[PDB]
């Protein structure tokens, strides 16, 4: 039956909030579990603004080293409207409180800006569990895959690459504000049961899958991945003379995606072209 | 001080100078003596007590402008340009201590306009020196209005002497014509009262416009008859009288060319002058006793100036004064929030680049105008908000 993500346990949440285990170690949070509804609403709001920028809050809880997100609600926008709409979190009947904020970067990669990192610093300083989601609408529309942006920042006065596609303009902002935040591994959870049963509506499409036009839809994504892998491997070599394991994993995922696209193309060719010859 | 602020200003000048000399002799930069200086000059001088219950507070910091006006205005024997310059030099030092310098440039510009247009300015060469000193205080933008006012005075002076040369090639004018062309958008003056030009002054008028058509193309002329004067002589009286009067009084007097008496209504209809202005002109003319009515016993005060009384020119005019001169004078808070909001994202921004991003992005409501935004950004950067760059170009930065 698995599940067990739901059934918000108030006592455990209060205990983990009062313990404050992330104050001692800065790299406490490493895994971000976004829900299906969270992603659906986030991407819908991100694309419902086109090239304009949208932002809202996302509700969830904390379990050990993972931060689970169950819901997300948009915002009207800096004026009194946003503050008035914030009361929705405590006005409705829901036990998930609030865990962070999401905001879109329409065509500017997935990194965190200077104002973004400053707001995240403030939010972490006075609201201990907080994460920032920096999803990109244009990239997921063009490439057909969703890129995630869980980018929790570091504390002030403390000292301790993936979507590097910004050609000219905002790459300067990327370089200066790069060590001020660390990415979180995004691992999606499906509630199973009802949603797993109802996911048959994806099977209803059956045409975008049969004609996917892969390997050209996200050609720029693969070229960027290879470009990142090149200096990842160069850094692994410099250290060697485990970054090599990470470079090997990245190469394996990129190659697996390429071979999956080729397999889809071969299946389509066998299904359609090799009939009535 | 309110009644005669002339000697009040002179008191401040004398006290300040002597304070420096006494300290360096024996005190050797005493802490107590220096501290007491900054507390006395600020509160007691900048804003005095009687500005509250007299419903006059804006005029108090504006008495410095009229003092400098008196030095550059045509008057009796004035101090030479050897001791006056050094007193004006220390005036520049104390001027930067005041925070509302904007009102200083307004009142001095209005007072300079009345001094220049009426030829009442003295030492016009020294006037250029005074304005040049004000340029170094803030910049050419601060004195943008003032410099144009002085420039067109010189242009009109050369224009008049060129017009005289043009007169020799044509029929000579029966009267000496001089005109200050002034400029539009840089002067406080504006045409407000309609006027019917007398038939005697029309021809010269036309002549000048011809001279302004060949010399300049695509330029109009908004004549200000309320600011124009002239000299009119009488050739039928017992004695020659060369009176000096404005254009309105000139037209009123010239209306008696064909007849001897006129009623107020005909004067209003023929010259198309507004009721209030014409009433004031008629009253000041009656003060000089140039025009009289039938009933001497009638009092002008308790009897209203109805537009039916028949005033006739006084043919036996023998007024005891030969020097008659009737030419004597008769909270928004949105733009600051917008500025800080737009400076939030961009740490460093130019002044004019910031302008427009706030000036006209929200222009659909409450058109803010440049000076309001300039003043608001000044009072913002004053209170530890923008802290502009130390001099590298004109970037305003943020917390840098
Ligand atoms: Zn952002």
Give the B window 315-354 contacts with A, CB below 8 Å.
Answer: 341, 344-345, 347
Residue A228 token pair: 């990142």
The DSSP string of A110-145 is S---HHHHHHHHHHHHHSSS-EEE---HHHHHHHSS
In the 8-state DSSP scheme, what is residue A49? T
Give the A window 42-101 contacts with B, CB below 8 Å.
Answer: 78
Q: Which residue of B has its CA nearest to A78?
A: B341
Residue A26 labeled ligand binder? no
**Which residues are bridge partners to A153 per DSSP?**
A181
Q: What CATH number was assigned to the domain covering residues B57-171?
A: 1.20.1310.10
Contacts of A78 in chain B (CB under 8 A): 341
Q: Give CA–CA dist A8/A231, Å, rounded.
A: 44
What angle (nearest 5°) sits at the alpha carbon of residue B352, between those of residues B351 and B356?
Answer: 120
Q: Give CA–CA dist A152/B132, Å, rounded.
A: 58
Strands (E), chain B: 229-234, 241-246, 261-263, 291-292, 310-313
Query: Token pair 């140039």 is at which residue?
Result: B290
CB contact under 8 A, A78 and B345: no
Q: Which residue of B has its CA nearest to A115?
A: B345
Distance (angstroms) between ligand 1 centre and the Cα of A158 equals: 22
With a CB cutoff of 8 Å and minimum separation 6, the contacts of A132 are: A100, A101, A102, A103, A112, A116, A120, A149, A150, A151, A152, A153, A181
Phi, psi for B231 (deg, rounded to 5): -115, 125
Contacts of B341 in chain A (CB under 8 A): 78
If residue A186 lies in a helix (H) or strand (E), which one and from where to where?
A: strand A185-186
Q: Which residue of A has its CA nearest to B344?
A: A115
The DSSP string of A6-26 is -S--HHHHHHHHHH-TTTT-S
Contacts of B345 in chain A (CB under 8 A): 115
Distance (angstroms) between ligand 1 centre and the Cα of A115 equals: 8
Q: Which residue of B has its CA nearest to A113?
A: B345
Distance (angstroms) between ligand 1 centre and the Cα of B4 equals: 64
CB contact under 8 A, B341 and A78: yes
Q: Cα torsion at B269, B271, B274, B276 (round to 10°)? A: -100
Going from the C-alpha of A96 to that of each of A34, A58, A92, A122, B366, the distances in angstroms are 13, 10, 11, 22, 43
Smallest CA–CA separation between A248 and chain B, in Å?
39
Instruction: Name all contacts of B233-240 with Cβ < 8 Å and 24+ positions apart.
Output: B237/B315, B237/B317, B238/B318
With a CB cutoff of 8 Å and minimum separation 6, the contacts of B186 are: B145, B148, B149, B152
Distance (angstroms) between ligand 1 centre and the Cα of A132 equals: 10
With a CB cutoff of 8 Å and minimum separation 6, the contacts of B15 are: none
Q: Give CA–CA dist A235/A244, Å, rounded.
A: 8
Per CATH, B246-313 and B314-400 having the same topology is answered yes
Q: Give CA–CA dist B170/B167, Å, rounded.
A: 5
Q: What CATH number was assigned to the domain covering residues B172-245?
A: 4.10.1030.10
CB contact under 8 A, A115 and B341: no
Q: Number of helices and strands (H, E) in chain A?
A: 11, 6
HSE, side-chain direction, 13 A CA sphere, residue B102: 8
In the 8-state DSSP scheme, what is residue B258? T
The answer, for A115 touching chain B at a CB cutoff of 8 Å, is yes
Distance (angstroms) between ligand 1 centre and the Cα of A163 equals: 14
The answer, for A122 touching chain B at a CB cutoff of 8 Å, is no
SS (H, E, C) B113-175: HHHHHCCCECCHHHHHHHHHHHHHHCCCCCCHHHHHHHHHHHHHHHHHHHHHHHHHCCCCCCC
What angle (nearest 5°) sits at the alpha carbon of residue B95, between those of residues B94 and B97?
Answer: 70
Q: Give CA–CA dist B122/B124, Å, rounded.
A: 6
Smallest CA–CA separation between A113 and chain B, in Å?
9
Contacts of A115 in chain B (CB under 8 A): 344-345
**Which residues are bridge partners to B292 per DSSP?**
B312
Distance (angstroms) between ligand 1 centre and the Cα of A121 equals: 14
Expressed as residue numbers, the domain containing A185 is 1-189
Experimental method: cryo-EM
With a CB cutoff of 8 Å and minimum separation 6, the contacts of B298 are: none
Q: Give CA–CA dist A132/A103, Å, rounded.
A: 8
Q: Which residue of A has its CA nearest to B343?
A: A115
**Closest of B400, B381, B354 to residue B99, by C-alpha:** B381
Smallest CA–CA separation between B347 and chain A, in Å?
10
Q: What CATH number was assigned to the domain covering residues B314-400?
A: 1.10.10.10
Smallest CA–CA separation between B345 and chain A, in Å?
7
**Closest of A127, A122, A143, A134 to residue A186, by C-alpha:** A134
Q: Which residue of B has its CA nearest to A117?
A: B345
Contacts of B344 in chain A (CB under 8 A): 115
Strands A185-186 and A31-33: parallel
Burial class (CB in 10 A: 0-12, 13-18, 19+), B108: buried
Secondary structure of residue A31 in the 3-state scheme: strand
In the 8-state DSSP scheme, what is residue B76? S
Residue A260 labeled ligand binder? no
Residue A105 labeled ligand binder? yes
Query: Considering the domain B246-313, what is its CATH architecture?
Result: Orthogonal Bundle (1.10)
Provide the number of CB pairs (under 8 Å) joining chain A to chain B: 4
**Closest of B343, B335, B331 to residue B385, by C-alpha:** B343
């Amino acid at each position: 039956s698995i599940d067990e993500i739901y059934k918000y346990d108030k006592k455990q949440q209060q205990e983990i909030l009062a313990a404050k285990p992330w104050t001692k170690d800065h790299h406490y949070f490493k895994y971000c579990k976004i829900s299906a509804l969270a992603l659906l609403k986030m991407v819908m709001h991100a694309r419902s603004g086109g090239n304009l920028e949208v932002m809202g809050l996302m509700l969830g809880k904390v379990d050990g080293e993972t931060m689970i997100i169950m819901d997300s609600f948009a915002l009207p926008v800096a004026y009194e409207y946003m503050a008035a709409y914030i009361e929705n979190a405590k006005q409705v009947g829901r036990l998930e409180n609030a865990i962070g904020w999401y905001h879109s970067h329409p065509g500017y990669g997935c990194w965190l800006s200077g104002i973004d990192v400053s707001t995240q610093m403030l939010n972490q300083q006075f609201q201990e569990p907080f994460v920032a989601v920096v999803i990109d609408p244009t990239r997921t529309i063009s490439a057909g895959k969703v890129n995630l942006g869980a980018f929790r920042t570091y504390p002030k006065g403390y000292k301790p690459s993936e979507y590097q596609t910004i050609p000219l303009n905002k790459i300067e902002d990327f370089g200066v504000h790069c060590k001020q935040y660390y990415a979180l591994e995004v691992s999606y959870f499906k509630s199973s049961l009802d949603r797993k049963l109802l996911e048959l509506l994806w099977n209803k499409y059956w045409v975008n899958t049969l004609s996917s036009s892969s390997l050209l839809t996200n050609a720029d994504y693969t070229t960027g991945q290879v470009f990142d892998l090149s200096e990842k491997l160069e850094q692994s070599e410099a250290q060697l003379g485990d970054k090599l394991a990470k470079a090997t994993r990245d190469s394996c995922k990129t190659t697996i995606e390429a071979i999956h696209g080729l397999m889809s193309q071969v299946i389509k060719d066998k299904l359609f072209n090799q009939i009535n010859i | 001080a309110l009644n005669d602020p002339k000697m009040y200003v002179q008191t401040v000048l004398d006290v300040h100078k002597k304070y420096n000399a006494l300290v360096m002799s024996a005190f050797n930069n005493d802490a107590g003596f220096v501290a007491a200086l900054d507390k006395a000059c600020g509160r007691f001088i900048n804003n005095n007590a009687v500005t509250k219950m007299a419903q006059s507070s804006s005029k108090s910091p504006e008495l410095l402008a009229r003092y400098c006006d008196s030095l550059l205005k045509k008057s009796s024997k004035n101090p030479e340009e050897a001791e006056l310059e050094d007193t004006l030099n220390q005036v520049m030092v104390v001027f930067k201590y005041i925070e509302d310098k904007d009102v200083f440039q307004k009142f001095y510009a209005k007072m300079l306009a009345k001094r220049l247009v009426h030829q009442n300015s003295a030492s016009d060469d020294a006037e250029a020196s005074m304005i040049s000193k004000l340029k170094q205080a803030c910049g050419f933008e601060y004195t943008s209005k003032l410099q144009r006012m002085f420039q067109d005075i010189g242009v009109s002076k050369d224009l008049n002497e060129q017009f005289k040369k043009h007169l020799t090639n044509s029929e000579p004018l029966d009267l000496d014509f001089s005109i200050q062309v002034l400029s539009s958008g840089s002067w406080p003056f504006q045409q407000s009262c309609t006027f019917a030009l007398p038939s005697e002054l029309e021809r010269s008028y036309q002549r000048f416009t011809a001279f302004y058509a060949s010399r300049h193309s695509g330029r109009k002329l908004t004549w200000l008859y309320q600011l124009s004067k002239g000299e009119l002589v009488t050739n039928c009286f017992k004695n020659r009288y060369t009176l000096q009067a404005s254009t309105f009084q000139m037209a009123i007097l010239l209306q008696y060319n064909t007849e001897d008496a006129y009623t107020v209504q005909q004067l209003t209809d023929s010259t198309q002058i507004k009721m209030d202005i014409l009433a004031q002109v008629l009253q000041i003319l009656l003060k000089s006793k140039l025009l009289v009515l039938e009933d001497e016993n009638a009092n002008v005060d308790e009897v209203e100036l109805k537009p039916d009384t028949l005033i006739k020119l006084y043919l036996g005019y023998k007024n005891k004064k030969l020097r008659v001169n009737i030419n004597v004078p008769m909270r928004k808070l949105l733009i600051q929030a917008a500025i800080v909001r737009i400076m939030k994202m961009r740490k460093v921004l130019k002044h004019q680049q910031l302008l427009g991003e706030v000036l006209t992005q929200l222009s659909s409501r409450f058109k803010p105008r440049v000076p309001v935004i300039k003043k608001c950004i000044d009072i913002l950067i004053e209170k530890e908000y923008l802290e502009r760059v130390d001099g590298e170009k004109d970037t305003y930065s943020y917390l840098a």
